[PDB]
Amino acid sequence: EYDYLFKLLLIGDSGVGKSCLLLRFADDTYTESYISTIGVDFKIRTIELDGKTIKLQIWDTAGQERFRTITSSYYXGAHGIIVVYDVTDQESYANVKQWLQEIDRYASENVNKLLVGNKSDLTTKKVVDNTTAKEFADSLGIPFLETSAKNATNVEQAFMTMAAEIKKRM
Amino acid sequence: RIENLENAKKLWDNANSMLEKGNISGYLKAANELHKFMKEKNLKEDDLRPELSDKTISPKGYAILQSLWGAASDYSRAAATLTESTVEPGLVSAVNKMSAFFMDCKLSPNERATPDPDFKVGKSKILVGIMQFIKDVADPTSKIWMHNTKALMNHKIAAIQKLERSNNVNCETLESVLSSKGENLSEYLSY
Numbered sequence: 001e002y003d004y005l006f007k008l009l010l011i012g013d014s015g016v017g018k019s020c021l022l023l024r025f026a027d028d029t030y031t032e033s034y035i036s037t038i039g040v041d042f043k044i045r046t047i048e049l050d051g052k053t054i055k056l057q058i059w060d061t062a063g064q065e066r067f068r069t070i071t072s073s074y075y076x077g078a079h080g081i082i083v084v085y086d087v088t089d090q091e092s093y094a095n096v097k098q099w100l101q102e103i104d105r106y107a108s109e110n111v112n113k114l115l116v117g118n119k120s121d122l123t124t125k126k127v128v129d130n131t132t133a134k135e136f137a138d139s140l141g142i143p144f145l146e147t148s149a150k151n152a153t154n155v156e157q158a159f160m161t162m163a164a165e166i167k168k169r170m
Numbered sequence: 171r172i173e174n175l176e177n178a179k180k181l182w183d184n185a186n187s188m189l190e191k192g193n194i195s196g197y198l199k200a201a202n203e204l205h206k207f208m209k210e211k212n213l214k215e216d217d218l219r220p221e222l223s224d225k226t227i228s229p230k231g232y233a234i235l236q237s238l239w240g241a242a243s244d245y246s247r248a249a250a251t252l253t254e255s256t257v258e259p260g261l262v263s264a265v266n267k268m269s270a271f272f273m274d275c276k277l278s279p280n281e282r283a284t285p286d287p288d289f290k291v292g293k294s295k296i297l298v299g300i301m302q303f304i305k306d307v308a309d310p311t312s313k314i315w316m317h318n319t320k321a322l323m324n325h326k327i328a329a330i331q332k333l334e335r336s337n338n339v340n341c342e343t344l345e346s347v348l349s350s351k352g353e354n355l356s357e358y359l360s361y
């Protein structure tokens with residue numbers, strides 16, 4: 001059992017590090033033959049926060065990179081969305097900025113949002129200035145964080161903060 | 171390897187051809203065939219993509235994939251409830267990955283789809299098509315919570331069709347069907 005079940009979306013283009021962010025999460029196995037051949041879009045993790053146990057079920061939707069017109073698919077039916085850009089690539093930052101602006105418009109206030117610049121450890125190759133992203137995030141009232149999925153730095157804190165801001169809402 | 175790849179190429183054409191005709195269930199099954207074959211033959215997207223240089227997915231195809239993507243993604247998450255959160259989300263999520271695999275065989279990473287607006291499939295029509303496919307590939311012993319999977323899919327298909335007949339299709343009513351695990355039925359379903 002658990003006390004809460006939160007549903008999270010992980011949005012971001014290929015190559016930015018979504019899979020590496022989810023390394024603490026586990027895949028449901030399936031006695032279903034059809035599933036075992038293919039696999040699934042989501043991973044699960046139970047955590048403890050403020051004396052409450054929370055099951056996080058997080059979607060890294062397959063094929064999202066193909067369909068970047070922002071519909072409800074990106075902002076309905078989720079307690080939290082985590083938007084990830086590659087800190088060493090300006091075009092991925094320009095892309096999430098655009099999408100996160102569009103989500104912000106339609107999204108209900110109840111959906112929580114977090115901007116994540118990933119690959120902070122590639123400091124020689126780093127192109128996107130955090131103070132630019134930080135101020136973009138501030139402009140929309142959204143938290144911002146830089147992470148290294150490989151080193152696992154600020155990854156835990158990203159999910160724990162997100163989980164804490166949903167939990168306070170409900 | 172040379173002839174395995176060419177058999178994968180034709181299986182891909184078959185799925186793309188199914189797509190060109192708006193045959194949803196037929197596209198999903200052909201994509202299933204392609205996936206199973208490449209897994210058996212140990213082929214990956216990278217191996218087959220060069221062979222597809224001269225093939226292409228139409229704007230019509232990209233329109234149907236987008237409808238399928240949008241509907242499956244919403245269904246996977248709505249189906250995750252306090253009753254059960256793995257099998258039904260898994261089944262729907264696996265349909266989505268299967269369709270993403272078809273596109274990855276053809277497309278470089280982060281290449282966008284160019285869908286045709288006038289060929290969008292309405293979300294209620296895709297959902298039945300997804301459930302009809304799940305019904306057909308689910309193991310006869312598969313269960314969602316306490317219900318047989320095939321039987322629950324029939325019940326949800328009929329529920330959505332009833333909403334369409336009375337012209338009562340909206341996100342609220344659809345979410346009720348997608349989140350339902352048949353808790354208010356009078357039987358645990360079976361053969």
Ligand SMILES: Nc1nc2c(ncn2[C@@H]2O[C@H](COP(=O)(O)OP(=O)(O)O)[C@@H](O)[C@H]2O)c(=O)[nH]1
Nearest residue numbers: 013014015016017018019020119147148149150
């Ligand atoms: N240096 C570094 N590389 C990363 C980090 N996160 C992901 N990567 C690299 O980026 C590439 C793709 O990451 P991946 O997990 O596949 O992201 P996804 O494809 O979008 O799910 C891989 O080669 C990773 O090793 C990070 O924090 N630091």
